[PDB]
Amino acid sequence: QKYEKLEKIGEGTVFKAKNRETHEIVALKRVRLDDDDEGVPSSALREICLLKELKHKNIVRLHDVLHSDKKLTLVFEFCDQDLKKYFDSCNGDLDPEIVKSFLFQLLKGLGFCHSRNVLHRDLKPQNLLINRNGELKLADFGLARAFGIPVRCYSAEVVTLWYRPPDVLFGAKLYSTSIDMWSAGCIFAELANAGRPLFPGNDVDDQLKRIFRLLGTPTEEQWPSMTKLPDYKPYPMYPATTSLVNVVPKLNATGRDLLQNLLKCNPVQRISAEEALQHPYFSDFCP
Amino acid sequence: ASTSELLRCLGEFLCRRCYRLKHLSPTDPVLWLRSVDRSLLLQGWQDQGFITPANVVFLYMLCRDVISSEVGSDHELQAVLLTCLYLSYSYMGNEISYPLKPFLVESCKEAFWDRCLSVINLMSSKMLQINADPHYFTQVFSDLKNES
């Protein structure tokens, strides 16, 4: 009644819509409440609770929530596309300044989430919204959670396999903001090459081999707790000497240093969003 | 610190808050909550029980701001308590999602969903603060203990 649908964006199902009163363009996420597959509403209520408390220009803005028919409608700001479509539209080929702008905005949004005690836990190109003016927003807080109350464990079933860090692949019970910084590193590698996933494993074993094959297998010195993790098993010792130059050809030495700080296997050694924003990659004086 | 102790403290708190409910037992809220957690586990929606000391403190934080002194029937108390419990599972639970069925005791589903959105509008800031601010968590935990 309040909104006219213009077209389906994808799948809840998402629609481009117009406010019937104001005529502003928005994105509507419709969530069915008369569950066929029980559970969907639960994730939508968590997303609403978190986005109510996360108002930042680099986090998708929830304007309103409507309850009509047997459905919940989440009213979001409208964005032109996601990073997946953006890669398809430019042959996966980004200008180095767009690489830098997109990572900068992702880190600002992520930095804001972490400072508010929220883990995103689902960073991937489909969840990064892109506007024609070059704005980037972090979207989809369906797997996000508040942290701070000490607990036995979180779920180890978080992040799609290709964006999941080695501590979580080894079945770590607890993780910090470090989980999202690994995913941010994976996305940086996509921006800085041809928009293809850096570590496209078929399963947990293949995922760990692809990571260690590029970065080197962490030593007992680098990661003393590694061998004690619940699903630890011995991996081959791949050398730490393998060049990153051809894996991220859009990046100079400065960009490669920031990528290595994001892709630290030991979660305690991973750079924070706040530290990453202070990296010389983002200075006015960067080559 | 015991789950049993804090659940008792919650039950005693609800009997004192809801002064119109002359035949409410302080064991009734504990029975309603234990029943939901048991059902979700046995039906395989979760691998472990949700009800822990920290999650009872979180539930109590919701209950004390949401539940009216003027609740008119034990049924209405159960409906509002299970709405706060559903939101606790949704915000703090380790599984991605939880089904509606165990939390629904009303014939009007529309009223359940309206209450979800009302509680979120009131409580979403404190739901994050009790995580972000360990001093606030300790304050709420102390308050629950002092309800006995």
Ligand SMILES: OCc1ccn(-c2ccc(Nc3cc4nc(OC5CCNCC5)ccc4cn3)c(F)c2)n1
């Ligand atoms: O041509 C085919 C194609 C491929 C991609 N696009 C496309 C992508 C995004 C937008 N705009 C948009 C999307 C939104 N999505 C939201 O939530 C979803 C996020 C991902 N996980 C599921 C929940 C929230 C708010 C949103 C605001 N704007 C678009 F217009 C087209 N089109």
Ligand SMILES: [Cl-]
């Ligand atoms: Cl609007």
Ligand SMILES: [Cl-]
């Ligand atoms: Cl911009």
Ligand SMILES: [Cl-]
């Ligand atoms: Cl979203």
Ligand SMILES: [Cl-]
């Ligand atoms: Cl090893």
Ligand SMILES: [Cl-]
């Ligand atoms: Cl092997």
Ligand SMILES: [Cl-]
């Ligand atoms: Cl490493």
Ligand SMILES: [Cl-]
């Ligand atoms: Cl009565």
